[PDB]
Symmetry: D2
Subunit: 142 residues, 4 copies
């Protein structure tokens, strides 16, 4: 069993991102999302799957999907923003198992990733515990 525990940080009172969606990819017997002590906890049965969280700021017409998983026994993460209305977490999560650019992001097995949207706001994932079954990450909204 792997877990990925996620702490969400929102660094500026400009806009407000709320949680709107959480998905589980079907590989390795799937997975679950849990709220545990104010954290998002992704539990997976083995290596080779993932889960996504979508956040939306309606004040500023902004959004992003953050995906976390384990690929060949190492954690990975990715952020996708500049989402169309058709790009829900359900769509984005699935794409990490067929779309080349998404595949590569997952294949990179990164301990940290950051990206800016069209408005120049940065989003980041940083794993604070990068090894073992029980992984920890910060999700940082700039």
């Amino acid at each position: 069993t792997y877990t990925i525990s996620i702490r969400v940080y929102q660094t500026t009172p400009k806009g407000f991102f709320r949680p709107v969606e959480r998905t589980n990819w079907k590989y390795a017997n799937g997975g679950t999302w849990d709220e545990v002590r104010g954290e998002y906890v992704l539990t997976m049965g083995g290596s080779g799957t993932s889960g996504s969280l979508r956040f939306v700021s309606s004040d500023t017409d902004e959004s992003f999907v953050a995906t976390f998983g384990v690929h060949n026994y190492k954690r990975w993460c990715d952020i996708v923003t500049n989402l169309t209305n058709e790009q829900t977490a359900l769509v984005i999560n699935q794409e990490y198992y067929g779309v080349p650019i998404r595949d590569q992001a997952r294949e990179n097995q990164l301990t940290s990733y950051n990206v800016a949207n069209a408005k120049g706001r940065r989003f980041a994932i940083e794993y604070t515990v990068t090894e073992g079954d029980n992984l920890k990450a910060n999700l940082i909204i700039g």
Copy 2:
């Protein structure tokens, strides 16, 4: 804009179903899930999309996916249980736009549905508000 506000009722202290997943299908400009006053609220850009909630009772090895949406300007609902490990809400939600028996449940535009798992536990959805932009449903776990 459509909303569907869901009240969850767990009726018997045998096992414990917890929320593990919430998805949004991509049609009609997507949609979102919100927690509002102890209720799950699905917001949708217009007619023709849906969202799924998955619940798991790990005590008793039981689970189900409940799906809610609007089809041709009327509400619909369905429950799927006896899930394989591969059947997350991500997977199930999509099947309502291609798989014939799932297509049928959507086309049925039901105000009320119920089914049972192989263990004999019943799951039900009853809309209490069936018309208009702001719909309401009970999700009853037996």
Copy 3:
């Protein structure tokens, strides 16, 4: 350290009780409330304190407070309903350390308790794990 983990069951689709308040008494170095995998978890520093949860059904103008704690190394529980508007969980929780009938309920160290409100609705607390540091209870709304 004691923990009491609480599963809430709402048994009838008549009215809807939503969580509105969660308090901690000051004795034994206090304590915290956490949400953990869909359950309410009361964590306390040692024996001799407690915490309260209030639920409101504004549809039917019903409310109650359920209090959980440890007194002389045994778990206890109680429910107060037919609440005035001035009887928040903040108020009720404190009454268990000065008000004689509340004191008595705490001193009973019950593994289960049930009571009916003005409208004949039954509320129940039933501990499923009655011994040790990590206690479990069902909160059942009839």
Copy 4:
């Protein structure tokens, strides 16, 4: 009826503050706490009462209580930190109706307030809507 809707911003990936308590003072027909679209909403029957939230960062031994209310038809707010183990939100909330320095903080009817703990971390409340029945505020953890 007054509402105060609160958006929480945790700005710094050092330590993690989780919600552990939410209370309602008994005056003016009391009040309730709701989770609404990822925000904390305090509802109160009229002017002259309040509610408190407590947040704890176990990793760094930090905590605080943030209190919001309406005093003589104008909003107020306060933060207390450097807490003892006996100072739960239950205790702090009610000190605003008896303890002079706390009474004064409330009598100030502030639209913004900030204070630091002994470790130098700033906490802040910033009302973004300051007038009328439905007030809005940012809670910023530095």
